Amino acid sequence: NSVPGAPNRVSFAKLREPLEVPGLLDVQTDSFEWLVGSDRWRQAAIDRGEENPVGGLEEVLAELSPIEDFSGSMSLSFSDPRFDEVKASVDECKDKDMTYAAPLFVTAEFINNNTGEIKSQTVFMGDFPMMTEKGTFIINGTERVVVSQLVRSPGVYFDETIDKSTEKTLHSVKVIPGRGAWLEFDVDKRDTVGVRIDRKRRQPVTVLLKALGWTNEQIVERFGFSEIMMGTLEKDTTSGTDEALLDIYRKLRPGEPPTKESAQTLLENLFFKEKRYDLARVGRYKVNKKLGLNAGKPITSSTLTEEDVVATIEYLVRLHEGQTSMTVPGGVEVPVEVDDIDHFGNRRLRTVGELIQNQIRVGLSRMERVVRERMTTQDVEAITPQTLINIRPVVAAIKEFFGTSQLSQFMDQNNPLSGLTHKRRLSALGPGGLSRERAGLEVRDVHPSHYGRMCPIETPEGPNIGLIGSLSVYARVNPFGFIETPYRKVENGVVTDQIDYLTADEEDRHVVAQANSPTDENGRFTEDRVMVRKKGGEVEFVSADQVDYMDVSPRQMVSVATAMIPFLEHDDANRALMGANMQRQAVPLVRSEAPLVGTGMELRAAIDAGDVVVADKTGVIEEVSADYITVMADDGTRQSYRLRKFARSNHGTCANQRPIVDAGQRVEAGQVIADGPCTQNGEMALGKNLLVAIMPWEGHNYEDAIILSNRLVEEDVLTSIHIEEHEIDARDTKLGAEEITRDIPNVSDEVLADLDERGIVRIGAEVRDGDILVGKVTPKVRDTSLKVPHGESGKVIGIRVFSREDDDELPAGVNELVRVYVAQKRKISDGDKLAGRHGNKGVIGKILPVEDMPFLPDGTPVDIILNTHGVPRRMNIGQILETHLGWVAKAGWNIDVAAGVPDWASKLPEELYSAPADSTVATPVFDGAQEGELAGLLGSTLPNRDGEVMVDADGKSTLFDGRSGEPFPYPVTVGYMYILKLHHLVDDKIHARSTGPYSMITQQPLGGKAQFGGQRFGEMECWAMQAYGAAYTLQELLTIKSDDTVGRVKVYEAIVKGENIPEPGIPESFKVLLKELQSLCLNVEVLSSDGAA
Amino acid sequence: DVNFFDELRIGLATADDIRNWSYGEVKKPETINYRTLKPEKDGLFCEKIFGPTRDWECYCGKYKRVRFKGIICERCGVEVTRAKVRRERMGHIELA
Amino acid sequence: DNRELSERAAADREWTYGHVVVDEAQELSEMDWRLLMRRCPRRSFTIVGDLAQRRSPAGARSWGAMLDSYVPGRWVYKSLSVNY
Amino acid sequence: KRLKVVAAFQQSGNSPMGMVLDAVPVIPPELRPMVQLDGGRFATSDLNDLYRRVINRNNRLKRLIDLGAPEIIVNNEKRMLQESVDALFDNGRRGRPVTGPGNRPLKSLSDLLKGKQGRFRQNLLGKRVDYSGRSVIVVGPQLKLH
Lengths: 1093, 96, 84, 146
Ligand SMILES: [Zn+2]
What we know:
- The structure is cut from a larger assembly and holds 1 copy of chain A, 2 copies of chain B and 1 copy of chain C.
- Chain A is of the alpha+beta class.
- Helix content of chain A is 24%, strand content 25%.
- Chain A has a domain at 468-550: Rna Polymerase Beta Subunit, Chain: C, domain 4 (Roll).
- In chain A, β21 (483-491) and β22 (494-503) form a beta hairpin.
- Chain A is globular.
- Chain B has a two-stranded parallel ribbon with strand order 2-3.
- Chain B is built from 2 helices and 3 strands.
- The termini of chain B are far apart.
- Chain B is α+β, with helices and mostly antiparallel strands.
- Chain C has 3 helices and 2 strands.
- Chain C is α+β, with helices and mostly antiparallel strands.
- A two-stranded parallel sheet of chain C has the order 1-2.
- Chains in contact: A-B, A-C, A-D, B-D.
- Chain B binds chain D through residues 11-15, 18-19, 21-22, 26-29, 31-32, 37, 39, 44-45, 50, 86-96, and chain D through 14-19, 21-31, 34, 36, 44, 48, 51-56, 58-59, 61-62, 65, 81, 85.
- The complex binds zinc ion.
- Zinc ion binds next to loops of chain B.
């Protein structure tokens, strides 16, 4: 369990989970703790067996130092990065628009080498943004998240292709570093080995070898085993090292004069000197692993080396000849094979810590040049470490990252699940990555290496399809950035409790069995054949003694949002994807209600999302209030927790927190103390349990439209609160300052009634569309007040004000700023979208009075009607199964055991033999209720209040028509389904226009939700109009309604005057085109059918 | 008369066509007046050539209201007419 | 083009063959061997002949004199003495 | 390929003399807007600069012919006038174009109709229209087909 306050949700699961779901936010917090070199991370690393681990900032400072004068007379070094406590709390930063940050300090040592003098000094490096306990950054009071970036790891990559000109098989290899020139080798269609250096022209590969100091005797000794290498050597017009170097230099430096020193040093600076070329630690690791070099030695350098180049060449030659095994002098034997680019053995996660580290590196590079200059422009006596350093480039780089980087994104605060998934999001598109414009299907496709590491279901459906995914629930990040997943060890056909986290490259070398495989006492497989996954991404029945590993859980492959879909395996992949996506866009409701049919994942997902308030240490409640809760621990110390009340989310949804504990209650460490926006008793609640009947109904649910009972509107079952935020700032101009004031010119006395003395609308005022919010005037004075936009309305819920007289820290040219918050409560209405967890989205087409809904013989009217014709074609019968189980969850059940356990119930745990009404159940996604169990439970449901069994064993009921009153001639499937209110509400999805603002540089209308823009008329619509032959309507659309100014004023006044719309004469476009043509000395003439005119 | 807009013909314009299109020769390289933002006389924005910027407003002010149409002012050559003519009236430059 | 392998191979002088069979090879001059080696960089050759039967003036007097310029010490000699 | 042009001039009254210009038309002022910006700065289409350059060269050529300068200077000014007219019509067509302070070429008369946002392509592209709206749809089963 590991959650003291967990409600008792009985589970249908048969298999036990030998591993608990890890911290779902660890992907963010562990990476950031690595970046700042936290003590916890260091202890964890040395526990893992890492040798003297070094933090992210330490790495960059060790790379930066020592900074030295080019004369060698002085040195500057940086050490000991540490952080002071944060300036302000997270909520204070949110309130006052500050960044949540900690001062960073580094010990700087300056040395004068000519004298040998020492100076050491503590240098302030700037305020460094800090991650919150929730895995987010508060930047200018806005809560943001940094998404992990999927990128190809540096290393040596071999490839095989077909020569279209000859159909011959050609091989090639690319050495790809973190920074530096590229180095390619290839065997072409004429059986000769060549090299491309820095993407310049191709050369015989020996030209490089000679340039590196190899004589013909050495090349023959090393590569003599292959005839193509000897043919390349014997057909090369290069005598030795100097000639080869000069030939390389010519291609590398076209048009420049070649000399010995220039070429000799240039070839070294390309690949073998650190300041201009380096494989990252991961790149060195990958190269050593593939080429079998430096095995049994610590990774301590970044450059390419002579042995790497020679081994790459030999590997390419061996691969070309079809060999499978290769061992090099001083190395170890390794397989010979091409590399799949999309395999997570080659892709890696550039997480938050590394993303911040790179920008720190850039800023420190700028500061390094600053030091190089002002160290050589001052008296050696006066120079000190603090007077050599300018921190501004570093702070500017960090601010640039957190304010402009595509990977730094406003957190999706629609609901807790959306934020939790956003923190765990993996993005292949971004700086240094790929783009939506030209990313092919190859990178988008699911890969067999994704198993247990990246979710195959939860991905966007638009142009980001396949490019954005989610980390699997059991996956963690290898310190080199590779995703690794846990497996139970298996030996001699008996499973054992040792858990090993394997990367995809490691896993390909093993046989992994299916977790659901049966095992008897002490772990031996019952059956002699087992499903296993194999390196080809294949599945096979191997002998039970042929298994090396087993999956730890059936759902090892799914993400958090996918794990929350009951009966997942009964739903098609597309509809499961739709349901997972829709769960993230479900809006919070005024009252949250946990699903009757759920998974085991709701509780941990809600807890790890962090919207719920959790007690830090065991104690007893001292105080409870709508605003705060106070606890006294067994230590005797006291804690106070503050609840967010009616706070606006980034998306406008309400973030209200509520206390659940009573005064004097025992509260254990980790127990939930306050519910979040979409949680009930700690577990997530994104929707409502509705009584659903599966039938067509008078065509009002045609084509997936939904029929709702008016009860849901009356009882606010699906009501939600939304808060809008409006800004207005008083500034200054050349003609003077601007005033926020109640004394607006020429406005009626009542229109400014609700405004206060400063001119800001009072709290609690009901503001209509177009009404005043904040009065402001500016010189010319003019009316420039803030007014409620088109369609918007609500109650003024809050006011925030900033003035430079209070040191508000606003930008230049602003004297005051006012934010007005307007709260609106929206009931479910026609046109609003609803959806289940199975992708069964729909639009509410009709809301019926309670007496019109079809009702059960008990008298209960159904809440929702879903059309039959959707289920069979869309292949998501999991919604039907849930519905059945939903009823079995609302009405209790009791399996008779007097004579014995029924056969169908023989796999039920004794705790599931009976349960009372309204008892919640768990049916995990790949280990839950089977068909026979569900049918038996349907047969075993308790009767209703009056002693009547309302739903038969098949899940159907004899509904009555609420209008005519007679029963329907056949029983209808009835049950309980969990329904989500989606954020696609009608209130802002509707647009209308009849003239208005217009574009100026060209005179066509505007386009925008809040800008009163018109609809676009594309060329396809013009094609349709031409096909109709409706010439006059097309002319109206083309000229009067879009471009014409005079035509518009004339037609509007004609409509207003109630007179005939003038029939258009000479087009306005034609007259400008004619003069444009004439200006180029072209005689353009209008011709009549009878002659020139 | 768009009811007789049946064909559109294109061809080389000769110097006489260019002189027939134009209302007057642009003599000076002047822009809008830097001193007062009025058009320069004989400039690229000259009102005597391309018409008045403001409706029925004579350059020298001897005719200034709507009732007057078509009249050339004897003192500055501007035609008292609707301002839209500045979108249609063509000029020309005589090359040496 | 969808041509047969032989069609595409015989039309181009730059084509490199995987194997070269030469029978009555004693008649080939040094330049013929140079050409054949140019067209077989992989150096896979099945050379068949009998030196005593040479009629060409420029033919080989010994296999080494022809083959050592390309594969010195990396060519294998076999003989079939029995005649039936 | 040559008879194409020669016959195109044979088969019509079209005189080839139109290929050499004695006068240059000037587009109406409002087709080349010049305005003062906020703060007293000025916004102007590049066409005005090209016309100004042409007028400057023409006036200076007239002056030189009046001054009786030797043929070399006079016809060097004529060459400059030719280049100015070429820049006016099609700036980048020959060699390197006339560039503004931003080291970018000035837009010429041809660019008015040449470009992706030229006159000939304005109507083709989709455009926003007034008296229009957009909204979500639901099934009106009680409605008649019309
Ligand atoms: Zn006048």
